[PDB]
Amino acid sequence: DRLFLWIFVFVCVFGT
Amino acid sequence: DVLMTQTPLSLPVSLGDQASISCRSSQSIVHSNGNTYLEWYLQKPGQSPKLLIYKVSNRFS
Amino acid sequence: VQLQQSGAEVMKPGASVKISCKGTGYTFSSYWIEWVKQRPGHGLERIGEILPGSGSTNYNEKFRGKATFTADKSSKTAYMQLSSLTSEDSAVYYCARYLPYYYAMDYWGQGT
Amino acid sequence: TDTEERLVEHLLDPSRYNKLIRPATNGSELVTVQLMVSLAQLISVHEREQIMTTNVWLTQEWEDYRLTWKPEEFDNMKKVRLPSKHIWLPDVVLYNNADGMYEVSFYSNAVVSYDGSIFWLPPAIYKSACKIEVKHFPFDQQNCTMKFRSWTYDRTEIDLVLKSEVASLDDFTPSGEWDIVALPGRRNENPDDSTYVDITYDFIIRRKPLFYTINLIIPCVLITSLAILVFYLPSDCGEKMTLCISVLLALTVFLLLISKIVPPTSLDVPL
Amino acid sequence: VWLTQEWEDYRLTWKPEEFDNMKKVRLPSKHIWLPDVVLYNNADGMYEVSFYSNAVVSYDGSIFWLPPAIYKSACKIEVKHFPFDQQNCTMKFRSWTYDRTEIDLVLKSEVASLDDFTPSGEWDIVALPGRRNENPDDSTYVDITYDFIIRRKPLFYTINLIIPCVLITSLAILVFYLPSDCGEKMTLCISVLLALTVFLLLISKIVPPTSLDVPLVGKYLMFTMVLVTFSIVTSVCVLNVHHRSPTTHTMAPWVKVVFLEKLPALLFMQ
Amino acid sequence: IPCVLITSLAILVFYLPSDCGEKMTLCISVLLALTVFLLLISKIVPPTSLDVPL
Amino acid sequence: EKNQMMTTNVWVKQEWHDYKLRWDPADYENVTSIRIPSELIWRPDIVLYNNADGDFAVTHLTKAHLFHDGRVQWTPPAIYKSSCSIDVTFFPFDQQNCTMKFGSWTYDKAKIDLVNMHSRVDQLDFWESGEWVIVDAVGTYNTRKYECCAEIYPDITYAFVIRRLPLFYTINLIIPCLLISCLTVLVFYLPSECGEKITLCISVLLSLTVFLLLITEIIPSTSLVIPLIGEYLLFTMIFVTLSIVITVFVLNVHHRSPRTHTMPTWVRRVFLDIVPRLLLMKRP
Amino acid sequence: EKNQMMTTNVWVKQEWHDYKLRWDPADYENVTSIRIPSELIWRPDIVLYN
Ligand SMILES: *[C@@H]1O[C@H](CO)[C@@H](O[C@@H]2O[C@H](CO)[C@@H](O[C@@H]3O[C@H](CO)[C@@H](O)[C@H](O)[C@@H]3O)[C@H](O)[C@H]2NC(C)=O)[C@H](O)[C@H]1NC(C)=O
Ligand SMILES: *[C@@H]1O[C@H](CO)[C@@H](O)[C@H](O)[C@H]1NC(C)=O
Ligand SMILES: CC(=O)OCC[N+](C)(C)C
């Protein structure tokens, strides 16, 4: 869960 | 499909004697418009059927 | 009015035959055409019906797949095509006019 | 042609042909009008607002003795085309229309024979009210009528007659949603009026039920099939309320959708 | 709009001193020759002006005609930057009777007039230039086209679409912080997906159904929906892993090595 | 009144115990209802740039 | 598509000869042509046969161009609302074929005959929609007899083959449907102790049903063909209903105890030896 | 109900006397009545107030 949380943070923040 | 059974299979009656044929259906054949669509046809040998009665209360001209 | 049917046909088992019914003296497209089968023994069995004006057709349970109806509006004729034939199919076939829920089937063909 | 224009000028000459006057002879004799409806297309049936829309050709035939000529005096011409707005017409209209449009759409030419016969076959798009029966939807059969009357002349001035006892389907395009069953026409009088005459056609149409079967009935049956499962679900799993409330919600939504499809009448409930 | 039209008709001249010094008069436009100038790119098939008002004729033959019209013109709607978009809806005028050999169309001014304009409230006017066009290969073609450059005011659609979507998207990641014992991961992720889908459908109902481009907001919603579907699959997998016991599964040694030792150190978990 | 009724529920999630396992249901349902009301009110009385309904 | 009706803005180009509208330009200052109101002269009565919710005939009545040799050129504009049967089997990747039949209403072939000015429909001033593209628009000349009348009436029928651009409905319907369909099998990997299987399967079923209804809002209510997307959605709904039934049964099995149930020996052997081995799952 | 409006389809029967539209039917082949376009004669201006 923590790994996927990190990945999703990165993808969402880079979704600029 | 609706099933119609006619009785008797044969009806012997001498000339001038009233005849009665009974016709019964698998289920009711009534219609909304207030009419029942039942019809009677006769077939003499070697000839196509002929219309006698439609909407039994009525009679073909 | 008059309904005229084609002539007699003799076919081999497994063959295909096509009967015709030509109506005149009335609006051909606005009346259903009823097809009736009568084996020599006894019994009038209705095969189905077709409305020439549209392409609508109905078949009885026993004759589904066995019989196919078509109509020609230009030449006021209706056709019944019978599938692979069997000795059980030998009979006299009639064509008749019909308007459901109103004046009903007062005219017949001579039979084929 | 010079002869044709001479004839047309002679026929429609306003000095000796008044189009406001019935072509009546023999004093109290009446003008006989033959009517025949040909159906080209059943454009739509709108159950919600209870309207049928059709494209029909309305054949109207009568005799005008004033529009006669001798062919030998006009280069042997047998018939001519005349504008329908310049000759007397029987004002035959659709009485039970919705949208308040009584007349035909186009007003084409009338074909006129040298003996006074008039042929008029104008096209029309008609919207007519009809009573929608919802009981057996979507396996329902509808009976929508088209009443034709003259709104100028009564039975003492013209007589409406049927060319045929059924409507014509010779140039019909099939619907794809509604199947035609019968199109009988009837001429109705009133024994207590003596000035009333109409010609009515009954459009007996039968819905093709596959579309609404697939899109309403099967989903409804599927949802209903879940209604029993709550009593086989163990109480420990903690999901009974979810299931039963969800089924209730789905059923209510389908009921509302059906209520939006059928007309909002109270004479019957769809099964 | 008012479709101002001016031309000279030499047959409508008079000497003022012979008519009490009158300099101009009003004539019904039905009774004089008109140029049949109408809108060609109209939708609904309405070409002509509305009323056919009176024309003002000067003693030298100058005609001034200012009829009103309600026009429905087709225009290409660009949805890429919705709801902060600006549209460019053109308006082509031509004579449907006379070609270039018979009448020449000319612009009185390079821009349309706003002297009697009532602001819309949802669309801002940016520019209304007009331009006269000829066809070098036809030589009988002439038209005047006005470009209506308008800008949407985005507060309404901001409030009603954008900010709700931002709030919903902010929750798309919370599922991975929710503990598996609380028994509510599916509720959250399924709700998020359904909300995103509902807003996508609403937008699809608002914009035209054209395929020339996609709106940026629609692309963003689609991307988020795919991410949330992925999160739902991952949450099902995580729940399956969480409810494992020695009586139904055996932990492979590599699972230990990786997940209990190496990955925790990388993620600062311990 | 329906808006006030819905709004009054926004604080309850913080008095709901964690053991009952219904916090998400409550807060998500409140958010859904509020969004529906915002959309409906906008349909009735659309907010424009100059003024937004209170 | 829902109402099965096409609306087009066209120019109806007509040209015929009038034997009375002839003059010698040398007698009128070399005037070779003029524009006259079309309501002052004879015109053919061309009508649209398959009119649906519109006008049968041209109503605008612009000016005709009359040439000194009797030639009359008339090009009025028209907006037509015609009927055409819609085939949505392959929606949104579908191609339609909507026809327009034109013919003189009261003049048979011996009095007025039609001629194809040019087989194709001119598109030199066409306004692109962004939703449909015209593949082919050709007019075909026909003649036929009607019951009304003893003579032959000609007509020209134009067939408009138009192809939909599928990106918009792809993005807005297909992808959401596929994303929801991906979730239809997830319930069977979910553990029974999480207490959420019913939530997931019910949500999927309801989402699919809403999508089916939304689709039905678009397609016509015809019964000749079934859209493939509708069939797909209905079969998915059927299988999700089966999945809910199976999930209820599985939850009932999971929560059994010796104090309430007894395990048949055949269940023991089958579902603890044979099926586990065939599914590549071995008990500790 | 939402818009508080009622739509109806009615026939507005009207009947009055015109002192100039009189004739002796004996003088006209016993013609006792005729139908004429209503736009040629005087008509009352009855209007629906609400
Ligand atoms: C479709 O609707 C029409 C109109 O409601 C139905 O027409 C009506 O049919 C009934 C039954 O045939 C007629 O009543 C019968 O009339 C005959 C002759 O007068 C009389 O002998 C019978 O005792 C009975 O009273 C009725 O007059 C007729 N109405 C009109 C206006 O024509 C029609 O039956 C319906 N068709 C279907 C298939 O539902
Ligand atoms: C379109 O329909 C017309 C007439 O039905 C037919 O001739 C033509 O082949 C059709 N075109 C296509 C592409 O189906
Ligand atoms: C004579 C006449 O008007 O006929 C109309 C019908 N049509 C177009 C089939 C011939």
Q: Is B10 in the pocket of ligand 1 (CB under 6 A)?
A: no
φ and ψ of G186, to 5 deg? -65, -25
Q: Is D202 in the pocket of ligand 1 (CB under 6 A)?
A: yes
Cross-strand partners of B24 = B5
Ligand at minimal distance from the CA of G134 is 2
Q: Which residues have C-beta atoms less than 6 Å from ligand 3?
A: D 57, 108, 111, 121; G 105-106, 146, 148-149, 153
> Any known ligand binding at G196?
no
User: Is the distance from CB of F14 to CB of F26 less than 8 angstroms?
Assistant: no
Q: Which residue has the tokens 């053991």?
A: F19
Sign of CA dihedral D9, D13, D14, D18: negative
- Residue G258, token pair as written in the block: 């010796």
Q: Is H13 helix (H, G, I), strand (E, B) or coil?
A: coil
In angstroms, the Cα distances linking B40 to B44, B49, B54, D179, E148 are 14, 10, 7, 28, 77
Distance between CA atoms of residues H45 and H12, nearest Å: 12
DSSP label of B58: S
User: Is the distance from CB of D197 to CB of D189 less than 8 angstroms?
Assistant: yes
Span from the CA of G97 to the centroid of ligand 2 (angstroms):
6
- Residue D13, token pair as written in the block: 């000459």
Q: Is A6 helix (H, G, I), strand (E, B) or coil?
A: helix
- Residue B25, token pair as written in the block: 């259906």
Distance between CA atoms of residues E62 and D74, nearest Å: 53
Best residue for ligand 1 mutational test, from D136, D166, D190, D202 (most atoms within 8 Å of Cβ): D202
- Residue D162, token pair as written in the block: 């049927």
- Residue G88, token pair as written in the block: 């949505």
Q: Which atom of ligand 1 lies closest to the CA of C101?
A: 38
Q: Which residue has the tokens 């329902």?
A: D140
Distance between CA atoms of residues D205 and D144, nearest Å: 8
Distance between CA atoms of residues H6 and H3, nearest Å: 9
Distance between CA atoms of residues B35 and C103, nearest Å: 13
In angstroms, the Cα distances linking C38 to C47, C89, H37 are 10, 10, 64
| Technique used | cryo-EM
Sign of CA dihedral B5, B10, B14, B15: positive
Scored b (16 or more CB within 10 A) or e, E49-61 reads: beeeeebebbbee
User: Is the distance from CB of B40 to CB of B58 less than 8 angstroms?
Assistant: no
Cis peptide preceding E136, ω within 30 of 0: no
Distance between CA atoms of residues E87 and G182, nearest Å: 39
Distance between CA atoms of residues F39 and F34, nearest Å: 9
Ligand at minimal distance from the CA of D200 is 1
Nearest to E54 by CA among E67, E70, E38, E72: E67
Q: Is D187 in the pocket of ligand 1 (CB under 6 A)?
A: no
User: Is the distance from CB of E41 to CB of E94 less than 8 angstroms?
Assistant: no
Distance between CA atoms of residues G265 and G258, nearest Å: 14
Instruction: Give strand ranges (E) for B1-61.
Output: 4-7, 22-25, 39-42, 50-54
Amino acid residing at B7 = T
Q: Which residues of C touch G145 (CB under 8 A)?
A: 74
Nearest to G113 by CA among G189, G16, G21: G16
Span from the CA of G159 to the centroid of ligand 2 (angstroms):
6
Nearest Cα residue to atom 38 of ligand 1: C101
Distance between CA atoms of residues C62 and E144, nearest Å: 73
Q: Which atom of ligand 2 lies closest to the CA of G157?
A: 4
Gap from E53 CA to chain F (nearest CA, Å): 36
Question: Is residue F32 less than 8 Å (CB to CB) from chain E?
Answer: yes
Distance between CA atoms of residues C35 and C46, nearest Å: 6
Amino acid residing at G86 = I
Q: Is D226 helix (H, G, I), strand (E, B) or coil?
A: helix
Question: Is residue E133 less than 8 Å (CB to CB) from chain G?
Answer: no
Gap from G245 CA to chain C (nearest CA, Å): 36
User: Is the distance from CB of C98 to CB of C105 less than 8 angstroms?
Assistant: yes
Q: C56 CB contacts (<8 Å, ≥6 apart)?
A: C50, D174, D179, D180
User: Is the distance from CB of D121 to CB of D106 less than 8 angstroms?
Assistant: no
- Residue G158, token pair as written in the block: 């134009």
Which residues 181-240 of chain D have a CB within 8 Å of chain C? 181-184, 204
The total number of residues written for chain C in this structure: 112
Amino acid residing at D69 = W
Q: Is C8 helix (H, G, I), strand (E, B) or coil?
A: coil
Report chain D's terminal Cα–Cα distance, integer Å. Answer: 67
Q: Is D204 in the pocket of ligand 1 (CB under 6 A)?
A: yes
Scored b (16 or more CB within 10 A) or e, D119-140 reads: bbbbbbbbbbbbebbbeebbeb
Nearest to F39 by CA among D73, E199, E69, B45: E199
Q: What number of other Cβ atoms are within 10 A of residue D255's Cβ?
A: 11
Hey, are the CB atoms on D182 and C100 less than 8 Å from each other? yes
Distance between CA atoms of residues G17 and G43, nearest Å: 10
Nearest to E163 by CA among F52, G170, A9: F52
**How do the domains of chain C map onto residue ranges?**
1-112
Report chain E's terminal Cα–Cα distance, integer Å. Answer: 74
User: Is the distance from CB of E152 to CB of E83 less than 8 angstroms?
Assistant: yes
- Residue G96, token pair as written in the block: 């339609």
Cross-strand partners of C94 = C36
Distance between CA atoms of residues G14 and G19, nearest Å: 16
Nearest to E225 by CA among G174, G104, C96: G174
Hey, are the CB atoms on H37 and D27 less than 8 Å from each other? no
Please spell the DSSP secondary structure of G160-195, one letter per residue: EEEEE--HHHIIIIIHHHHHHHHGGGGGGTS-GGGS
Gap from G144 CA to chain C (nearest CA, Å): 10
Amino acid residing at G165 = L
Q: D85 CB contacts (<8 Å, ≥6 apart)?
A: D107
Question: Is residue D164 less than 8 Å (CB to CB) from chain C?
Answer: yes
Nearest to C94 by CA among B11, D204, B1, B51: B51
Nearest Cα residue to atom 1 of ligand 3: G106
Amino acid residing at D224 = T
- Residue E49, token pair as written in the block: 């002006």
Please spell the DSSP secondary structure of chain E, one letter per residue: -B--EEEE-TTS---GGGTTT--EEEEEGGGS----EEESSBSSS--S-SS--EEEEETTSEEEE--B----B--PPP-TTTTS-EEEEEEEEEESS--TTT-----SSSB---TT----SSEEEEE-BEEEEE-TTTSS-EEEEEEEEEEE--HHHIIIIIHHHHHHHHTTTGGGTS-GGGS-HHHHHHHHHHHHHHHHHHHHHHS----S---HHHHHHHHHHHHHHHHHHHHHHHHHHHT--TTT----HHHIIIIIIIHHHHTT--
Nearest to D187 by CA among D203, D198, D174: D198
Strands C57-59 and C67-72 come out as unpaired
Q: Which residue has the tokens 């504009």?
A: G77
Q: Which residues of A touch E220 (CB under 8 A)?
A: 15
Hey, are the CB atoms on D246 and G206 less than 8 Å from each other? yes
Sign of CA dihedral D67, D70, D71, D73: negative
Neighbours of chain A (3+ CB pairs under 8 A): E
Nearest residue of chain D to residue H9 (CA atoms):
D100
Please spell the DSSP secondary structure of G21-50, one letter per residue: EE--GGGTTT--EEEEEGGGS----EEETT
- Residue E269, token pair as written in the block: 């978990």
Q: Which atom of ligand 3 lies closest to the CA of G47?
A: 8
Quick one: which H or E segment has residue D244? helix D240-261
Neighbours of chain C (3+ CB pairs under 8 A): B, D, G
Q: A1 CB contacts (<8 Å, ≥6 apart)?
A: E176, E177, E180, E238
Q: Is G114 helix (H, G, I), strand (E, B) or coil?
A: coil
In angstroms, the Cα distances linking G57 to D124, E252, G61, G101 are 12, 82, 10, 12
Q: What number of other Cβ atoms are within 10 A of residue C3's Cβ?
A: 23
Distance between CA atoms of residues D7 and D10, nearest Å: 5
User: Is the distance from CB of D34 to CB of D61 less than 8 angstroms?
Assistant: yes
Span from the CA of G101 to the centroid of ligand 2 (angstroms):
13
Ligand at minimal distance from the CA of D79 is 3
Q: Is D159 in the pocket of ligand 1 (CB under 6 A)?
A: no
Instruction: Give strand ranges (E) for chain D.
Output: 31-46, 51-63, 79-83, 92-94, 109-113, 117-120, 123-129, 141-150, 158-162, 178-182, 185-189, 197-207
Hey, are the CB atoms on H35 and D27 less than 8 Å from each other? no
Q: Which atom of ligand 1 lies closest to the CA of B31?
A: 39
Across the interface, of G127, G175, G195, the residue whose CB is closest to E222 is: G175
Q: Is G238 helix (H, G, I), strand (E, B) or coil?
A: helix
Nearest to G8 by CA among G56, G78, G76: G78
Amino acid residing at E136 = P
Nearest to G156 by CA among G120, G210, G204: G120
Across the interface, of C29, C99, C101, the residue whose CB is closest to D169 is: C29
- Residue H26, token pair as written in the block: 């004996």
